[PDB]
Amino acid sequence: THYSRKPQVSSKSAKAKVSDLRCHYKNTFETANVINGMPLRKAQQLYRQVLAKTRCIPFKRYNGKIGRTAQAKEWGQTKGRWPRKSVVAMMSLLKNAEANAIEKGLDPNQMVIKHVQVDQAARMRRRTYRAHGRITPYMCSPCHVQLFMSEK
RNA sequence: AAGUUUGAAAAGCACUUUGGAAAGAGAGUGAAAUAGAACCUGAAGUCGUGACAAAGACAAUGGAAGUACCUCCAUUUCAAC
RNA sequence: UGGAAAUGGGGUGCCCCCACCCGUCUUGAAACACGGACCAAGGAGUCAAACAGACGCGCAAGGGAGGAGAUAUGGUUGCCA
RNA sequence: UAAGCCCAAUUAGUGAUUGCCCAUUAUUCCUUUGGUAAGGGCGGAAACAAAUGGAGAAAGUGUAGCCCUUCCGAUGUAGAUGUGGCCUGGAGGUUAGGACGAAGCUUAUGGCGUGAGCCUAAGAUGGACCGGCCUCUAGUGCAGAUCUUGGUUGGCGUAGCAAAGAUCUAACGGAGAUAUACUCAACAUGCAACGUUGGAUACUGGAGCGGGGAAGGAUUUCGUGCCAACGGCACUCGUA
RNA sequence: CCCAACUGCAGACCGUACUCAUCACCGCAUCAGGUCCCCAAGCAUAGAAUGCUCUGGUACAUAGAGAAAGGUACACUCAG
RNA sequence: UUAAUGAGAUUCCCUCUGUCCCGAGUUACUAUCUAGCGAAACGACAGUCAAGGGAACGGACUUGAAGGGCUAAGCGGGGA
RNA sequence: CACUGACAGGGAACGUGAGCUGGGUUUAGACCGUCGUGAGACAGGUUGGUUUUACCCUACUUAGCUGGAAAUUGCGAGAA
RNA sequence: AACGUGUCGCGAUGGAUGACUUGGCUUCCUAUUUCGUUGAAGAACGCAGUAAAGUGCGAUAAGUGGUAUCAAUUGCAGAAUCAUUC
């Protein structure tokens, strides 16, 4: 799962990624995309406020027949959610990215996220049992997440 | 059902750092690591991403003519030629 | 002699005018007739025998085997079934 | 005072007998293709180096068609036939390519062909085979048979995961926290969910989620470790 | 040789864990179905009806928030 | 023909009632919102109408009338 | 039969079953009559007999967000 | 605006294609070539320092003996001899 884009200045950037996360791809897709252009500290604050349920993750693409909320108005939407499993996974990834920036000698307070990509990982198979003795797939959809941030 | 068909050789990634771990970020080996492990080549379909093109509602696609903008394409020409 | 000027090609959009969904059975399909979500790989006039005609070739009042022998080979992994 | 109906005109009692607009039709011009095609040329006329008029000319069904001139036809289901027509695997010949990169794969890479297709360019693709031509040969060309196998996919984070009533609390255990740029005292920025023990509340109500056996199962029994996958939520727990 | 009361020595083989079920068996599964036997307490009551209870067992079966319409219910009521 | 018997078929009467006049209120579990998890059916392409013709009952065609885009909960007219 | 001003006739796939209901009609059980040698038959009678799926698109019902006069552009300039 | 659409670059998912072939299929040939109560074929259970399957073997159990060969086996470990036979 290589990085699809390269940073403008490599020495002033930090990279982080995770493969086969075992989080729902669609929920993680929405969670990671909202921080694409944000400063690292602002992204961390938003995730904490999502866990506190004072702010929400806007669901822009995979939002078919989900509920509506007022907390999505700040993103220009009406449908949003609070996917805590995706959120805590993304916060761990941000911590790894911050550690990489610290290791390279950069200041995390000045790091701005520049690239966020979420991909559909290989699917894990389970089965569910249906009426009239039918067996039917019960699939798990993990995701690949990659990001990098650069000093502003 | 299923070719373990990585590489010439395991030389199968020491060591540093973050992480409970998985792994990530570095660093190394190798001609090649996008050859990293049941790993040669890696198509189609589908999806993510950045850049750009725009676009009401005539479902979309299509035909014929132009035009706007773009073009890592081709060819020609550059002096009384 | 330039990141050049031209002409052609390619790409995307837009105008005006055209333009019913493929395959199929059927007198008649755009059909309120049936098969029709996408892609990859696979998927259907073949082999043998009898006869006939057309055309090519050899010979011709004659044509031709076939089976089997013979030895170059009573040799050679094989070429040489 | 038709843009209706009937009749009649073509710029109007002026001097003459074509108002205007639309075809895959007609005439004509250019190009292609095929003919029951029609003809001409094919005994190299002579002469001609570079520095500074050219090129070709094949006795021919079919090709980049030997060349030139001329005339006519050209749509079409089922179907027939033809094609120096296209393409695929293999064989007999011939001629080439490849570590300075073969096959395969990719394309806003163009060029050529009416077309099947062929060829070049680029790969910041690949890493060892392979192209053209004549002949031979066959398991030789896919869009669809409720076709076969494999993979994918919208529906979709949707339907739902609602019988068997019900859980609460503290401490301990655990990576599973009380996890924060600046500002800022804590609330308004780390949520949720756990295993054990003690309390609390309730359930099973002896025809029992009690204690033992047969059939069936065969290590599920016990202890320690362990959380990748599995127990359709979760687990630090487990018949994993 | 036969007995009695002793005594001395020797008493082989296989089975034996666990389960027997709203999770250990069958039903594709830890499936509200199916599956033979034994032991069976207190009170009310005619009682193996039904309700509650000491012993033993259990809170395991996705949960949280929470008065939309419409539903399901081994949930009710309604003037004349 | 027939006493007794019957989850058998039929008619009337008493009692009774939300069967109805004619609907209303309440409860548990759903739906609804959230966390975790997560399908299938179906899927030519698609999806606003009127008339006209048409394989005589069009979402595509002719001529008109509509049509800014994207969404949540419902609903059963159509999608022969 | 009764009330009433009046109790008019019709259409909408003989409107309307993923709206219900299932009495009838039209399976398999069974009885009778008639018919048939028989198996069986009868727009003759009788009794008993599983009514499945919407979460898709439109339509309708409500419920949110939000561009836009060159109806996204032109800078393309029109004031009830 | 936002969903959504289209194109290009780069990634993911997915294992087609090519190259590779200790396999299959098919056609020939050779011969002191045809099992077993002297217990066969088949079935079962065991055997290694380390050993589930498979293979080999049978309490002499990944083998004993003999002949030839002529310095190994090999993931680790073990091992007199480094060798005319012993």
Ligand SMILES: NC[C@@H]1O[C@H](O[C@H]2[C@@H](O)[C@H](O[C@@H]3[C@@H](O)[C@H](N)C[C@H](N)[C@H]3O[C@H]3O[C@H](CO)[C@@H](O)[C@H](O)[C@H]3N)O[C@@H]2CO)[C@H](N)[C@@H](O)[C@@H]1O
């Ligand atoms: N760009 C648009 C799309 O390109 C596609 O094709 C693209 C790719 O299949 C193709 O392959 C590219 C290659 O060009 C490029 N030079 C290198 C790249 N590695 C390749 O990409 C390939 O490898 C990478 C990983 O290495 C994968 O992530 C990726 O999925 C795979 N397609 O490059 C093509 C772009 O020209 C499709 N043909 C088509 O759907 C569409 O036109």
Ligand SMILES: [K+]
């Ligand atoms: K001609």
Ligand SMILES: [K+]
């Ligand atoms: K010729």
Ligand SMILES: [K+]
């Ligand atoms: K076809």
Ligand SMILES: [K+]
């Ligand atoms: K989907």
Ligand SMILES: [K+]
């Ligand atoms: K035990």
Ligand SMILES: [K+]
């Ligand atoms: K699991």
Ligand SMILES: [K+]
């Ligand atoms: K009540």
Ligand SMILES: [K+]
């Ligand atoms: K009785």
Ligand SMILES: [K+]
């Ligand atoms: K129209």
Ligand SMILES: [K+]
């Ligand atoms: K009806």
Ligand SMILES: [K+]
């Ligand atoms: K019967």
Ligand SMILES: [K+]
């Ligand atoms: K009944």
Ligand SMILES: [Mg+2]
């Ligand atoms: Mg819903």
Ligand SMILES: [Mg+2]
């Ligand atoms: Mg919703």
Ligand SMILES: [Mg+2]
């Ligand atoms: Mg089920």
